[PDB]
Amino acid sequence: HHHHFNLPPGNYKKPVLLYCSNGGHFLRIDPAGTVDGTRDRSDQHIQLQLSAESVGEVYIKSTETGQYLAMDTDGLLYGSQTPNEECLFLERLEENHYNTYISKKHAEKNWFVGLKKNGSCKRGPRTHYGQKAILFLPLPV
């Protein structure tokens, strides 16, 4: 393990919005496979369903399009039509409160899912422990 194992409470029984407190955006997976954040809670591409592959390891899927959130070899988030190794994330508790998602494939490099204040996704190498961009709260739909 390259990381701690403090896990968040709550389960995967229902779909959630992944809210980034950094700029106040909900994680959005566009039908074209594009990923970013939006502040519009009426958007139909921010509803996500998480599922556990192993304890603490999850897939994050758009309920609207069925796409899986994934992080590519250069650190960019994208929507994948099929589940692959780039779609698994280590879900952890952070600052005793928030949920963070580390790319399993690139866990040794500490590449996180994160949104900037302007709503754009952060590239894996630009993320790290301590940033506000990596902190999410799973709000009920």
Q: Which helix (H) or strand (E) holds 48?
A: strand 48-54
Burial 63-79 (b: 16+ CB within 10 A, else e): bebebbbbbeeebebbb
Residue with tokens 């390891």: 57
Which experimental approach was used here?
A: X-ray
Q: Is 22 one of the annotated binding-site residues?
A: yes
Four-residue CA torsion sign, 131, 71, 73, 109? positive
The structure was resolved to a resolution in Å of 1.6
What distance in Å separates the CA atoms of residue 42 and residue 101, rounded to the nearest whole number?
24
Domains of the chain, earliest start first: 1-141 (2.80.10.50)
Contact criterion met (CB below 8 Å) for 103 and 80: no
What distance in Å separates the CA atoms of residue 122 and residue 140, rounded to the nearest whole number?
24
Contact criterion met (CB below 8 Å) for 17 and 49: no
Burial class of residue 82 (count of CB atoms within 10 Å of its CB; 0-12, 13-18, 19+): exposed
Residue of 128, 38, 27 whose CA lies nearest to 75 = 128
Residue with tokens 């994208």: 78
